[PDB]
Short mmCIF file of C-alpha atoms and ligand atoms in Angstrom, two decimals:
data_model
loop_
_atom_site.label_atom_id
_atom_site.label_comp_id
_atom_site.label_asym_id
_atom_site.label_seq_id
_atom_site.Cartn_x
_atom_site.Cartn_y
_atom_site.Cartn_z
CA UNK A 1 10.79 9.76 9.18
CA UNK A 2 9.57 6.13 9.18
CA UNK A 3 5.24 6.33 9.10
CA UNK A 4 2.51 4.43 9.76
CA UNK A 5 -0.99 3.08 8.14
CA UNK A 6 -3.57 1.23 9.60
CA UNK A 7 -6.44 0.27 7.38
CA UNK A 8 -9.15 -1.02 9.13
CA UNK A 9 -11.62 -3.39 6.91
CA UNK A 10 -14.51 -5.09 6.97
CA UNK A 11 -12.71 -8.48 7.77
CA UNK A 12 -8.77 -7.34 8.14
CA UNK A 13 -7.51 -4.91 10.03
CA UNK A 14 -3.88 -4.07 9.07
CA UNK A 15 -0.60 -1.97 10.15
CA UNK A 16 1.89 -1.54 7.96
CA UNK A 17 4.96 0.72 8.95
CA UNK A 18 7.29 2.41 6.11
CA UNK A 19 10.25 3.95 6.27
CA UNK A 20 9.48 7.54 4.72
CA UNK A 21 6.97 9.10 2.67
CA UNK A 22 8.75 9.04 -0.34
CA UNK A 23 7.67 7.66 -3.90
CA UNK A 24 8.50 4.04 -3.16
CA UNK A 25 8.63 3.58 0.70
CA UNK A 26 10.07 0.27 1.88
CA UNK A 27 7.73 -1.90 4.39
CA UNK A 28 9.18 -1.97 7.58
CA UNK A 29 6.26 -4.22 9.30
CA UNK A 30 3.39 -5.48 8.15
CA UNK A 31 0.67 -7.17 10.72
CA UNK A 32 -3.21 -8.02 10.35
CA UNK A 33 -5.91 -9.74 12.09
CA UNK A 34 -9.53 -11.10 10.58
CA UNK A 35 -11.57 -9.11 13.58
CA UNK A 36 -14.40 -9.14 10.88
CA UNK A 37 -16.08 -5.77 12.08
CA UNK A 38 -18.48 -5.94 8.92
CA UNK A 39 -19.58 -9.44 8.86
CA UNK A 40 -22.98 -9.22 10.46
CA UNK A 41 -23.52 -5.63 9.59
CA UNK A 42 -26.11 -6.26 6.68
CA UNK A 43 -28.10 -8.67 8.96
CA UNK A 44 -28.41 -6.75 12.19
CA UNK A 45 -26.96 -3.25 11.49
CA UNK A 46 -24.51 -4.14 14.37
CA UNK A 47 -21.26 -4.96 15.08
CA UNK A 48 -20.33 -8.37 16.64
CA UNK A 49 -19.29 -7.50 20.61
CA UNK A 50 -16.77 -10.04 20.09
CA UNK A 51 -15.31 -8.29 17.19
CA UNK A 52 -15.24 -5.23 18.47
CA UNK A 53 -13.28 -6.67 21.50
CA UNK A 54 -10.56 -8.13 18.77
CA UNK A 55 -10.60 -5.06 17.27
CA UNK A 56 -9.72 -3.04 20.38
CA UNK A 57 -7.29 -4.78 21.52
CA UNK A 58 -5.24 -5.17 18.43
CA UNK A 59 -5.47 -1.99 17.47
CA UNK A 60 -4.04 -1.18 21.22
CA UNK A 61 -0.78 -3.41 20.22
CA UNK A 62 -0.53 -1.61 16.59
CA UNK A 63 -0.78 1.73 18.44
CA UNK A 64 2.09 0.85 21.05
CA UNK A 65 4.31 -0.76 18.12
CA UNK A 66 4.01 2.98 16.57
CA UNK A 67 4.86 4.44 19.79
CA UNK A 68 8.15 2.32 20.35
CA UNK A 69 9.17 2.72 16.58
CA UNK A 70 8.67 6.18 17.15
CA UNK A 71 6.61 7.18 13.90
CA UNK A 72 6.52 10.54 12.64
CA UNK A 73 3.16 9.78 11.31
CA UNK A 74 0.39 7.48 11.49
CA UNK A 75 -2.84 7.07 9.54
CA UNK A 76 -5.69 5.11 10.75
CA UNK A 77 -8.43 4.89 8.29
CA UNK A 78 -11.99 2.99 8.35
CA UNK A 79 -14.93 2.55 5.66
CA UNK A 80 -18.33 4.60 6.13
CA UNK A 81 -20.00 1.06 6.14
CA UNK A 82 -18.59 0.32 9.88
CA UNK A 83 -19.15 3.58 11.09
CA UNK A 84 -22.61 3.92 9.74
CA UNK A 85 -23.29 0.44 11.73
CA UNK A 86 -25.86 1.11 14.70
CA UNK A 87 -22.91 0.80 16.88
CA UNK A 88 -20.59 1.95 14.70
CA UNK A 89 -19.90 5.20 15.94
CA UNK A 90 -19.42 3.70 19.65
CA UNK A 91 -16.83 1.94 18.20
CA UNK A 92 -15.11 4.67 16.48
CA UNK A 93 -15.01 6.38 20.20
CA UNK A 94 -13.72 3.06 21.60
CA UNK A 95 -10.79 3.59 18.72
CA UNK A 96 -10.00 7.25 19.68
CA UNK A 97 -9.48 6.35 23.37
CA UNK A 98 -7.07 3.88 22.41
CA UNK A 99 -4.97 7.03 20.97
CA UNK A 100 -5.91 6.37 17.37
CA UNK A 101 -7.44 9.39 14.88
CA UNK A 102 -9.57 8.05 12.81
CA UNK A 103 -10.49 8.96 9.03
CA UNK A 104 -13.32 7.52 7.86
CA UNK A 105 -12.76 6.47 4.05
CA UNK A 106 -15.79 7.08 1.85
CA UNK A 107 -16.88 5.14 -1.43
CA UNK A 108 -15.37 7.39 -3.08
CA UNK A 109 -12.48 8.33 -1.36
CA UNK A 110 -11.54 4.45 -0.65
CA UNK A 111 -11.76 3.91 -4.50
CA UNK A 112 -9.54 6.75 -5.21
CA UNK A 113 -7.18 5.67 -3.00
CA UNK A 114 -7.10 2.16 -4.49
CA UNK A 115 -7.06 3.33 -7.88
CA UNK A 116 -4.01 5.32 -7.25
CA UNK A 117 -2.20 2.19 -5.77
CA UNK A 118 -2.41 0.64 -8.83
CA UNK A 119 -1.65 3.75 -10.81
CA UNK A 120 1.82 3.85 -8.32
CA UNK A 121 2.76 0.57 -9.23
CA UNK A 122 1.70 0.53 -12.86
CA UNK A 123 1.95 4.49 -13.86
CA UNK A 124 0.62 3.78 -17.69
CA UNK A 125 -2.14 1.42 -16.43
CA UNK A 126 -5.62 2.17 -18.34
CA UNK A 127 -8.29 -0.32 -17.11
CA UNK A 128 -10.74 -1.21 -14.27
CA UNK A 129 -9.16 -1.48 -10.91
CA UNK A 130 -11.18 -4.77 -8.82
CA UNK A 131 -10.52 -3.82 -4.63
CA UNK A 132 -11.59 -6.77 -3.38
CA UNK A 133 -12.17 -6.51 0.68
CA UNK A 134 -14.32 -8.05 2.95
CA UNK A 135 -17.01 -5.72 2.85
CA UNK A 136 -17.09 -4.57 -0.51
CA UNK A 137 -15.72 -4.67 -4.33
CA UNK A 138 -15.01 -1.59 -5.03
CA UNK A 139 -14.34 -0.66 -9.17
CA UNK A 140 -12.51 2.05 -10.56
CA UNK A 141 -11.55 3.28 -13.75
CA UNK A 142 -7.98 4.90 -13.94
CA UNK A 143 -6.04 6.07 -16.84
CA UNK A 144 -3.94 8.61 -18.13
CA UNK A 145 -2.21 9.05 -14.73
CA UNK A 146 -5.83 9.69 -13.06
CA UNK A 147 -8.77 7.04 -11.89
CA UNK A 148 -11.95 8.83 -13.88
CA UNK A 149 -14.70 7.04 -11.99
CA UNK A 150 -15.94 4.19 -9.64
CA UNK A 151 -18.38 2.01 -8.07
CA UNK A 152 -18.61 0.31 -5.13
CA UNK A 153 -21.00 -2.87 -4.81
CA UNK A 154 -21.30 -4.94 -1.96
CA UNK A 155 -19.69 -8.08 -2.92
CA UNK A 156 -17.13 -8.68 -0.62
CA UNK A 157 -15.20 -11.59 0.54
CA UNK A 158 -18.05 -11.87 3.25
CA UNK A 159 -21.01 -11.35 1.14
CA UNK A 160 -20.21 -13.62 -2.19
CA UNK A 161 -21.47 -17.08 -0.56
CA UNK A 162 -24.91 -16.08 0.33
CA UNK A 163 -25.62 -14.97 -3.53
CA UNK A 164 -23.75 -17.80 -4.71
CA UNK A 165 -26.04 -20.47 -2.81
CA UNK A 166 -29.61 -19.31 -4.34
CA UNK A 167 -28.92 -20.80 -7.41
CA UNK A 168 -25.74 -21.47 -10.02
CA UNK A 169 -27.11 -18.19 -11.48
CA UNK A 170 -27.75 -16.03 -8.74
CA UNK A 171 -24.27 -14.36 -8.84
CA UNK A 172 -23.94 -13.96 -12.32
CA UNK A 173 -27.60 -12.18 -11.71
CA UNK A 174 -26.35 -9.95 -9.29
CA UNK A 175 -23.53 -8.85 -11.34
CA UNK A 176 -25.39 -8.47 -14.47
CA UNK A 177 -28.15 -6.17 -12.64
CA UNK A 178 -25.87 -4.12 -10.83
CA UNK A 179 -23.74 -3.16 -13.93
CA UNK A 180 -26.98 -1.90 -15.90
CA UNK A 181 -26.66 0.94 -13.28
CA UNK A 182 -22.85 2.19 -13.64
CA UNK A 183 -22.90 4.03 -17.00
CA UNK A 184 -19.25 4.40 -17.73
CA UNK A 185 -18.37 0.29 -18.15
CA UNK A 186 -19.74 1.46 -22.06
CA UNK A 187 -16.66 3.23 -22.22
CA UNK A 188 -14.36 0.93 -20.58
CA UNK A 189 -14.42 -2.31 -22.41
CA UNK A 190 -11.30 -4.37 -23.41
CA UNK A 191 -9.16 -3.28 -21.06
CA UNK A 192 -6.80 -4.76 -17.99
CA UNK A 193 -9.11 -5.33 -14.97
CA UNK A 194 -6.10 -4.69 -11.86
CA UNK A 195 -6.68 -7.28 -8.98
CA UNK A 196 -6.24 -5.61 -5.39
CA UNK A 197 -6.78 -7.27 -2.12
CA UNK A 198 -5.83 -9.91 -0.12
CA UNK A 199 -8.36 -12.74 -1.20
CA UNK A 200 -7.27 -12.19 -5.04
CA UNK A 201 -4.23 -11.87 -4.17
CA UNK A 202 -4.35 -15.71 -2.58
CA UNK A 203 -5.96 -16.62 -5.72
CA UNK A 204 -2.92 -15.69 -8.07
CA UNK A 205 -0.77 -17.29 -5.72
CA UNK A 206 -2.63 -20.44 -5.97
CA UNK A 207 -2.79 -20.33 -9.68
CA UNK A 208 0.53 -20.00 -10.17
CA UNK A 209 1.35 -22.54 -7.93
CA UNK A 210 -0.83 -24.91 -9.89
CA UNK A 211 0.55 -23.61 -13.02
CA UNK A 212 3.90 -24.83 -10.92
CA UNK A 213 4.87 -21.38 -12.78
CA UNK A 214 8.90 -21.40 -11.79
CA UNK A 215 9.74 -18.59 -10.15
CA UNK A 216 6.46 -17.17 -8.72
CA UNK A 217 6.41 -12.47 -8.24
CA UNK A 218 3.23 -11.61 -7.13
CA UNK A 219 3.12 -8.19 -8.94
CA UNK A 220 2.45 -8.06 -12.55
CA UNK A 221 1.21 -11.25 -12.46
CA UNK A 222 -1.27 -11.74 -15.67
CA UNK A 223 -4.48 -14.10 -15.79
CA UNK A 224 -6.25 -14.96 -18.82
CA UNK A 225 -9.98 -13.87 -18.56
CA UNK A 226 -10.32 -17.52 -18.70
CA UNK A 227 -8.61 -18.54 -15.98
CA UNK A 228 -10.92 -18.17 -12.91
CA UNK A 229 -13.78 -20.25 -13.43
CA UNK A 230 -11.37 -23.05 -14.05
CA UNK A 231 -9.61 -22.26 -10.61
CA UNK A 232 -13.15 -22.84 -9.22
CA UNK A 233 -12.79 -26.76 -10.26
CA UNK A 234 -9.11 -26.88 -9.01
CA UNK A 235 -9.70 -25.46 -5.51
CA UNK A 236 -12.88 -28.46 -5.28
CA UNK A 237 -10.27 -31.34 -6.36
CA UNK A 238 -7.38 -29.91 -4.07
CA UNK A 239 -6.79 -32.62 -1.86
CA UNK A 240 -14.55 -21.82 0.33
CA UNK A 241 -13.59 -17.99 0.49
CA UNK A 242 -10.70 -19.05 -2.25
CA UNK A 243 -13.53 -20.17 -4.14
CA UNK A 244 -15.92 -17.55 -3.30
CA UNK A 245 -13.06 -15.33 -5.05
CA UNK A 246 -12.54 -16.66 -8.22
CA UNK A 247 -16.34 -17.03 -8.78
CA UNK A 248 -16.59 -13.42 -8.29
CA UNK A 249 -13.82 -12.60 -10.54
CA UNK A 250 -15.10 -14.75 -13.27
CA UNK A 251 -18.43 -13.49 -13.36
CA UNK A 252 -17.00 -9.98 -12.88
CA UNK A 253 -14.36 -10.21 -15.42
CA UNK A 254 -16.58 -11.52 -18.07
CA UNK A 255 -19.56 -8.50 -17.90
CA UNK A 256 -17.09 -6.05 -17.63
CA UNK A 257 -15.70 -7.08 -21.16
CA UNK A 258 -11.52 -7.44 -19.15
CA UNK A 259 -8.63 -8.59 -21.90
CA UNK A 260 -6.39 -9.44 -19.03
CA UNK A 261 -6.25 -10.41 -15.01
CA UNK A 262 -3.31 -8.18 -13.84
CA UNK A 263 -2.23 -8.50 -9.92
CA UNK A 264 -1.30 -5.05 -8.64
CA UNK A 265 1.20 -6.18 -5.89
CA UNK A 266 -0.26 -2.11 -4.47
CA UNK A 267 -3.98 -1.34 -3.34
CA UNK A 268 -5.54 1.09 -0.95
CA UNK A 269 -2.77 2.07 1.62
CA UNK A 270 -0.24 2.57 -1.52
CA UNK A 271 -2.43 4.68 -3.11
CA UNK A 272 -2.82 7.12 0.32
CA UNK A 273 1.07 7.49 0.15
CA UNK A 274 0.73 8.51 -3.55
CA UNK A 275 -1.88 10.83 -2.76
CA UNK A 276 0.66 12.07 0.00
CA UNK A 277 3.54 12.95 -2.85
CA UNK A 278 3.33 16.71 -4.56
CA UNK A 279 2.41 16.37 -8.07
CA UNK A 280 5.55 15.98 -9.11
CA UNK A 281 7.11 13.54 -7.01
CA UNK A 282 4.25 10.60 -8.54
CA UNK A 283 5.04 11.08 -11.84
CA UNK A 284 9.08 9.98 -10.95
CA UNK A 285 9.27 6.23 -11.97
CA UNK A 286 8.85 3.89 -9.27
CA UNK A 287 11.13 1.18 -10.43
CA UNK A 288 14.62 3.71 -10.94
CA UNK A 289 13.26 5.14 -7.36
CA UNK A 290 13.24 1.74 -6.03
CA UNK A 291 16.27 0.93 -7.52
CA UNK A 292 18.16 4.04 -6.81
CA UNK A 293 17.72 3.70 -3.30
CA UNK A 294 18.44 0.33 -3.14
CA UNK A 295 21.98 0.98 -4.50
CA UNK A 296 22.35 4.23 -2.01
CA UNK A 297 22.06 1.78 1.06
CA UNK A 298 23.82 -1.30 -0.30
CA UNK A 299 26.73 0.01 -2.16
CA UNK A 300 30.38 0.15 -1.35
CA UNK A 301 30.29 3.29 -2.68
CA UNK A 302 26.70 4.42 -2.53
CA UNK A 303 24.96 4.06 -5.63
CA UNK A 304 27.72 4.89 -8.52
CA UNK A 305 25.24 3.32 -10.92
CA UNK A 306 23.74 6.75 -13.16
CA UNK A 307 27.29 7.51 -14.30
CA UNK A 308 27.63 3.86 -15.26
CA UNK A 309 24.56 3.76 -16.96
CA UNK A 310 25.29 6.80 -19.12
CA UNK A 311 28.91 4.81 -20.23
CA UNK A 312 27.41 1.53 -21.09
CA UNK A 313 24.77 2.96 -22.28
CA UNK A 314 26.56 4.20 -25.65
CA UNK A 315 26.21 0.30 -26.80
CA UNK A 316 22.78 0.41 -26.66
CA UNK A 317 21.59 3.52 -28.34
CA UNK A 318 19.25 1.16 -30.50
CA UNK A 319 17.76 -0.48 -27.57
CA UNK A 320 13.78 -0.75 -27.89
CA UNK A 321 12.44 2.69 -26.37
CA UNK A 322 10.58 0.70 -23.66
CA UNK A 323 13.93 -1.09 -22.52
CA UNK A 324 16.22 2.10 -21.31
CA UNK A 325 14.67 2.11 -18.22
CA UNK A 326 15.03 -1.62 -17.69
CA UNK A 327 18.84 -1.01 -18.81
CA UNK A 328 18.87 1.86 -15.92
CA UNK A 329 17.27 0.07 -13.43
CA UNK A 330 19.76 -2.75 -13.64
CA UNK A 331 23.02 -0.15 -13.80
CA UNK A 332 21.21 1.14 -10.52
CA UNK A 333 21.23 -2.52 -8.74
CA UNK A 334 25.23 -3.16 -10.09
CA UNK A 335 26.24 -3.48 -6.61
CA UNK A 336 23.83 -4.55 -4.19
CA UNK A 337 25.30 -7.91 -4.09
CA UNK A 338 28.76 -6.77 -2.92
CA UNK A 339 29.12 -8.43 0.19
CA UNK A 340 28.17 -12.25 -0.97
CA UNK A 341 31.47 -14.02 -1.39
CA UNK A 342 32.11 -13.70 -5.45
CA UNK A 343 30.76 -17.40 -6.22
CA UNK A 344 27.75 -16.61 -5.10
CA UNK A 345 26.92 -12.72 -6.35
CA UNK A 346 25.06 -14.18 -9.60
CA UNK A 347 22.72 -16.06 -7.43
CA UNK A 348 22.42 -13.38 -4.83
CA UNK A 349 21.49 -10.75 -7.42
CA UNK A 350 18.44 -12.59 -9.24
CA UNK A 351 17.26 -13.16 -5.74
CA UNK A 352 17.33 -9.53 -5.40
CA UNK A 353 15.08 -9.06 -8.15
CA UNK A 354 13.16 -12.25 -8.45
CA UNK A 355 12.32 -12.07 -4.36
CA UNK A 356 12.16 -8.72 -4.13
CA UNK A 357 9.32 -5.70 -3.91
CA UNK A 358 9.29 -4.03 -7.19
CA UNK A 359 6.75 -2.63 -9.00
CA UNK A 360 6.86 -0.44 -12.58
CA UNK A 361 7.85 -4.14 -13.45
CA UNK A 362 6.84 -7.07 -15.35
CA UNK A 363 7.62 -10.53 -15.56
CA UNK A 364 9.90 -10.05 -18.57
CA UNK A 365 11.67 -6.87 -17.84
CA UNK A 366 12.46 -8.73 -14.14
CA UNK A 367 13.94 -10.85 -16.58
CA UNK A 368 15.80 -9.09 -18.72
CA UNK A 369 17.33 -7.19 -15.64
CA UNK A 370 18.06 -10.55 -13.87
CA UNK A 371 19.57 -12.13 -16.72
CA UNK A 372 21.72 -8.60 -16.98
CA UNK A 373 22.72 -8.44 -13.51
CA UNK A 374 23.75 -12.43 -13.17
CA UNK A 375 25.77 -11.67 -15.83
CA UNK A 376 27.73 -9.41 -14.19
CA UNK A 377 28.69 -10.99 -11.39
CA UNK A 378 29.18 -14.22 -12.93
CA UNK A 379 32.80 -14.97 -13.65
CA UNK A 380 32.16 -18.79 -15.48
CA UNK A 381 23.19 -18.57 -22.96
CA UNK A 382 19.43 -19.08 -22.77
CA UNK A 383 16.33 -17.81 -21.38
CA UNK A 384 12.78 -19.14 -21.66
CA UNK A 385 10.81 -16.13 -21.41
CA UNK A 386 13.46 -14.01 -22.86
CA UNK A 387 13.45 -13.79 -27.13
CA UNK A 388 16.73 -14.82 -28.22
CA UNK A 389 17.55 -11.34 -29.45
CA UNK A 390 16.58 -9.97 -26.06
CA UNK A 391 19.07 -12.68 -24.24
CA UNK A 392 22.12 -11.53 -26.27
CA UNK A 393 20.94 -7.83 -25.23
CA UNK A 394 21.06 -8.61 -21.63
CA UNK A 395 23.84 -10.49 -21.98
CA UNK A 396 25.49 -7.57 -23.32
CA UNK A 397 24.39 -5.46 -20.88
CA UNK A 398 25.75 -7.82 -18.18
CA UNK A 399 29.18 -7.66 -19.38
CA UNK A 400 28.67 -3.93 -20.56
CA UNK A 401 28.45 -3.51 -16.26
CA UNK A 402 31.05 -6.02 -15.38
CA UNK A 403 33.83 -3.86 -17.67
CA UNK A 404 32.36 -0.97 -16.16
CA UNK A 405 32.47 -1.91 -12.77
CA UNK A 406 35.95 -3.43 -13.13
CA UNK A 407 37.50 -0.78 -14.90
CA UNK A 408 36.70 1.76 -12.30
CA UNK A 409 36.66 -0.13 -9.21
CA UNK A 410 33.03 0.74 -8.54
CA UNK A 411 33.73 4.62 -8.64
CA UNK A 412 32.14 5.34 -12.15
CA UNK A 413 32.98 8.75 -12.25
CA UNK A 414 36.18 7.47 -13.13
CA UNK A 415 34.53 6.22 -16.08
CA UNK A 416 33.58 9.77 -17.94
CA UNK A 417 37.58 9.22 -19.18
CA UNK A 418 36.55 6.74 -21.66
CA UNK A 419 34.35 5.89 -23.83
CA UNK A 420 32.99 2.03 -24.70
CA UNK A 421 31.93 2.27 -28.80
CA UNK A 422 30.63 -0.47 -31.29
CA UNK A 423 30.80 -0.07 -34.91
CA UNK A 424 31.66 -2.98 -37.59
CA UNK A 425 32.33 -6.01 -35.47
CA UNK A 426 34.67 -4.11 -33.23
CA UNK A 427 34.24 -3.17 -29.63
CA UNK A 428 36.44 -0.31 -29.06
CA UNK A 429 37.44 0.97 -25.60
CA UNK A 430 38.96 5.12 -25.80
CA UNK A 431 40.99 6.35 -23.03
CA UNK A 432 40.80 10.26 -22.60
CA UNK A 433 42.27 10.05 -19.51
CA UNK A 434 42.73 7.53 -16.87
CA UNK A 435 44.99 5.79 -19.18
CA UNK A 436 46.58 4.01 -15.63
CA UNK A 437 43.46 2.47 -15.02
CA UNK A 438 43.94 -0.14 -18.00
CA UNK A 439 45.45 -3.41 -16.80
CA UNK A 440 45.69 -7.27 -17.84
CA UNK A 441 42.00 -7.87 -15.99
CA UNK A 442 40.54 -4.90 -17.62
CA UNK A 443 41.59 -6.24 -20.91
CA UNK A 444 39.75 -9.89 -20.30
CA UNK A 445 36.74 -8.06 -18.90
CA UNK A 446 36.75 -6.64 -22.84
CA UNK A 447 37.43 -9.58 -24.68
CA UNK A 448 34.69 -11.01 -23.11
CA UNK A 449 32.05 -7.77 -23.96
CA UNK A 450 33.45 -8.39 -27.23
CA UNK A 451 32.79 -12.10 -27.29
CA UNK A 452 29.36 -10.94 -27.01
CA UNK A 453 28.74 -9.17 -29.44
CA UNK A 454 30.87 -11.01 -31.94
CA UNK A 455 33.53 -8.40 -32.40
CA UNK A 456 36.81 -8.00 -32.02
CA UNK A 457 38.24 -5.84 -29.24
CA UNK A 458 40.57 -2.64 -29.56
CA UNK A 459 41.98 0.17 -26.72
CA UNK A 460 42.29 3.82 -27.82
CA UNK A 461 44.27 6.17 -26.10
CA UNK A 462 42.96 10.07 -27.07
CL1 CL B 501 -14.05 -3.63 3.54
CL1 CL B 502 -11.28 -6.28 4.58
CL1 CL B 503 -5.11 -5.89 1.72
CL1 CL B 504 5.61 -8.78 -5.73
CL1 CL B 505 36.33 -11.95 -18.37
MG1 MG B 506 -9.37 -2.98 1.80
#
């Protein structure tokens, strides 16, 4: 069931192979060139001969890479700029006799589609997407679940240093003109503007690196409006395009009135496989489908982790609304780290989720779950980004799991035979049934939930 996109650019032309069509798919392979089809396209109205040639041929090796891997589907889609080129349709027949059925993208369909990558990987987003490319910058409003409208303007990677060289104004110009002309920006001020593409994508990645922010996850990762023309004076003191970039986003940022710089780790070729899903499959959370899976292929057992999340889970009743899920997601990962030799499971875990691909995510639930998870494989607190209140909760959580985990072995059905209860300073663990399941390391596994939550610790039997 494994399938196949390749989304040919203006500049990049890109497989990527999943494993199924499914809400989350996992990448497989991923593999680009910069053929730069579009690069001399405004000049001429043609397409380079030598990029065509590049283009041909790698498109030949992504083709025989699906054959081998034996897709069940494959995509290939290209922008109406390159086939409207005076050779563009030559190429297009060059493509097909490679093997290759080609879609050619629209405006509007390519700024659907990259809208509802970033309404996969964010489902409550409500902003202005930014699709970057090489050709073009394409805008779109989503929210609700839906993208409302969108532009495209042709700012792309390869079009940004020509404006910027007329004069220190000329972009800011451009930008200011075109938007006079797109009548729903009114209507979409002080909002997220969602970064997609490769060359903003670069650009986060360098500012965090500057930032020498510690643990660096692409997804999620938030810019103050600020922060671009700044990046401008770092990339000339660093001892073009990346430059380029952040001009664009600056100027960009500013007239469209954005509160925030969020990178959508999903663009485009997400947003086809969401468009893929029935109606109801999108709306399932991304994060818990992630997660699930992850568990389902990793676990000793598959994933056990919904029937421990429904024990722990009466501790945490009063949990903020917002961190359930985060709470789920991390009962959902409680054994993915299994087969690391048990000094290291703690470590192996955050990697997990600090290294990862996970989206429905941000930087401080990936912490909360982290802390959680290290927890509970850690058999020895503080957190920076965590609130102190919020530490103690994970903490909880953590050794909420390990009990769990221990108690049962791993096989949490075991666990609907007890019950785990707080109420006045004591922790208080019922037996039902499965009374043979309590034991001397069962009983430390306790104490310790207990220590944290500064109670004292009691078994029922019922
Ligand atoms: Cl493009
Ligand atoms: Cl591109
Ligand atoms: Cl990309
Ligand atoms: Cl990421
Ligand atoms: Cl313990
Ligand atoms: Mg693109």
């Amino acid at each position: 069931g494994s399938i196949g996109i390749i989304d040919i650019g203006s500049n990049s032309i890109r497989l990527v192979v999943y494993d199924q069509l499914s809400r989350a798919p996992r990448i497989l392979f991923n593999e680009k060139i910069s053929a730069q089809l579009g690069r001399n396209i405004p000049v001429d109205g043609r397409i380079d001969e030598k990029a065509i040639e590049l283009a041909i041929s790698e498109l030949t090796r992504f083709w025989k890479l699906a054959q081998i891997m034996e897709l069940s589907s494959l995509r290939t889609v290209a922008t109406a700029a390159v086939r409207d080129a005076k050779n563009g349709a030559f190429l297009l027949g060059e493509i097909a006799k490679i093997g290759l059925e080609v879609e050619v993208l629209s405006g509007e369909e390519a700024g659907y589609a990259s809208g509802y990558g970033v309404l996969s990987a964010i489902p409550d987003a409500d902003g202005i997407v930014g699709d970057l490319g090489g050709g073009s910058l394409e805008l779109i409003r989503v929210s609700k679940g839906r993208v409302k409208d969108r532009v495209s303007l042709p700012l792309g990677v390869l079009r940004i240093a020509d404006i910027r060289k007329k004069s220190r104004n000329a972009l800011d110009n451009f930008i200011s003109e075109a938007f006079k002309k797109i009548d729903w920006l009114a209507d979409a001020r002080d909002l997220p503007f969602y970064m997609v593409g490769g060359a903003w994508r670069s650009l986060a990645k360098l500012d965090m690196h500057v930032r020498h922010y510690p643990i660096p996850v692409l997804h999620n990762y938030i810019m103050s409006p600020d922060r671009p023309s700044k990046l401008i004076r770092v990339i000339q003191r660093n001892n073009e395009q990346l430059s380029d970039a952040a001009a664009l986003l600056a100027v960009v940022s500013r007239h469209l009135h954005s509160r925030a710089l969020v990178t959508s780790a999903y663009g485009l070729r997400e947003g086809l496989l969401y468009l893929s899903l029935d109606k109801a499959t999108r709306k399932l959370d991304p994060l818990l489908w992630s997660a699930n899976q992850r568990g389902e292929t990793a676990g000793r057992f598959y994933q056990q982790g919904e029937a421990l999340y429904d024990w722990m889970s009466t501790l945490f009743a009063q949990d903020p609304p917002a961190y359930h899920r985060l709470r789920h997601a991390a009962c959902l990962l409680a054994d993915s780290a299994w087969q690391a030799n048990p000094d290291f499971r703690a470590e192996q875990i955050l990697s997990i989720i600090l290294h990862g691909r996970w989206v429905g995510l941000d930087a401080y639930g990936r912490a909360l779950i982290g802390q959680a998870l290290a927890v509970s494989y850690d058999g020895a607190i503080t957190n920076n980004l965590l609130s102190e209140a919020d530490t103690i909760r994970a903490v909880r959580w953590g050794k909420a799991i390990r009990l769990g985990m221990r108690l049962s072995g791993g096989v949490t059905t075991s666990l609907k035979k007890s019950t785990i209860l707080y109420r006045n300073n004591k922790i208080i663990l019922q037996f039902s049934g499965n009374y043979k399941l309590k034991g001397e390391t069962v009983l430390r596994r306790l104490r310790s939930l207990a220590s944290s939550f500064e109670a004292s610790e009691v078994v029922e039997f019922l």
